[PDB]
């Protein structure tokens, strides 16, 4: 059977993100590899490319997502993308101070390392450790950025409001069980979101620099959503 | 100083702390429009730093940290206070109750203008109140660029819930109103850089010292 997105209890909601979560991939083995600024840049691309694929699978899963038009679906990972990149890479990097770890292979240190947003990342990421964000946040977060990102770019949009208070409930449910106070709750959730608003912040420079330097578009993500369908 | 205040005291100090709704100086052109923009935005940002000065918490903070946080904020600060004067004019944007343009007006920016509109449909839609606006335009403020400024915020957020609470919303509905309000904050923050995109200390410092 199926549950429609705004019949979800928390647990229910939980644990159709968790089963819906990518894998951690790997950077290319490439050890002969050149140093420059189109290497490095190279090796990111290449990682971003991977993760695009399994990021429209994940949100074929996120509920309410596949309740959208084809065209709806595309405009918000349009406008996501980015943003869900970032947040997987600060999530990964958080038992790491000092460095992002872009993947298990490719840890890379701020001397390394783009020149604004990386400072950026390192400080996103610290927040996170000091708040001692959990995977079932994490998970409820990165759906908020898919859900949220580009809705007010675009009844319908009354349905993702409502799902997106589903995951608003969830993340206070988790907030209680963890034993905060009902305030404690309220200020975790203001100061998780805020941290949203930082990583559109960084995503923006990012898409800056990308579009300087082509950078996933509209027709691509069309052609990948669609070609989900025939996946096995 | 702000850790001491109730939350009723917080409403009032920033009701009180708010600026003045600003005139632009027949039809419109390109540089007509955008030199008229310029020149309300440069009047608005002397009452913003005015406003600033009187928010509970900011006077605290280091000169830098003043000005880090004015010259981080400034553009999403005017753009929701344009989206909240706009709000009962739905596909127009009141710059000043003299100048309040049209989509088709936009094009003499079209991009961001449809952003702004969106949003002040959204605030519509949701029924923002002014105590609430102003508890949003803080947090603008302070989140834009420690623990004292975390220690505020966690304040703001309280005083949010606490007019709630007291317009009658439940447990539930709380926590549903104050995540649709601050995620509407990102949108802002992504219409500010897009204008700084377009567009690319001594009025800050003389005002802020
Ligand atoms: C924040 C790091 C980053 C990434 C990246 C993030 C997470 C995981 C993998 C890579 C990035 C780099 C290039 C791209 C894509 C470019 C393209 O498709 O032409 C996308 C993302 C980036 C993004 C913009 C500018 C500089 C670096
Ligand atoms: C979104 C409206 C806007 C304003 C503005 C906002 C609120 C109130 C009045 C004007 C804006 C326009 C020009 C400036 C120019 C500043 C400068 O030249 O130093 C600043 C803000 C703007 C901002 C960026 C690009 C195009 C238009």
């Keep these: ?77 349009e406008s996501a993308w980015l943003e869900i990149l970032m947040i997987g890479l600060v999530w990964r990097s958080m038992e790491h101070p000092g460095k992002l770890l872009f993947a298990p292979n490719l840890l890379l240190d701020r001397n390394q390392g783009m020149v604004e947003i990386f400072d ?19 998970v409820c977060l990165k759906s908020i950025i898919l859900l949220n990102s580009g809705v007010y770019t675009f009844e319908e949009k009354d349905h993702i409001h409502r799902v997106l208070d589903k995951i608003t409930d969830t993340l206070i449910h988790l907030m209680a069980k963890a034993g905060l106070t009902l305030q404690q709750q309220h200020q975790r959730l203001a100061q998780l979101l805020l941290i949203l608003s930082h990583i559109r912040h960084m995503s923006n420079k990012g898409m800056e620099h990308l579009y300087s330097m082509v950078v996933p578009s509209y027709d691509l993500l069309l052609e990948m959503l669609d070609a989900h369908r025939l996946h096995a």
């Design 1 to 77: 059977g199926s549950h429609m997105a705004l019949s979800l209890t928390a647990d229910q909601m939980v644990s159709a993100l968790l089963d819906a979560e990518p894998p951690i991939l790997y950077s290319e083995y490439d050890p002969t590899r050149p140093f420059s600024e189109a290497s490095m840049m190279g090796l990111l691309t290449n990682l971003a490319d991977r993760e695009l694929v399994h990021m429209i699978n994940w949100a074929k899963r996120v509920p309410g997502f596949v309740d959208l038009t084809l065209h709806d679906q595309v405009h918000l990972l």
């Design 120 to 138: 950026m990342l390192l400080a996103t990421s610290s927040r996170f450790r000091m708040m001692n964000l959990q995977g079932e946040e994490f």
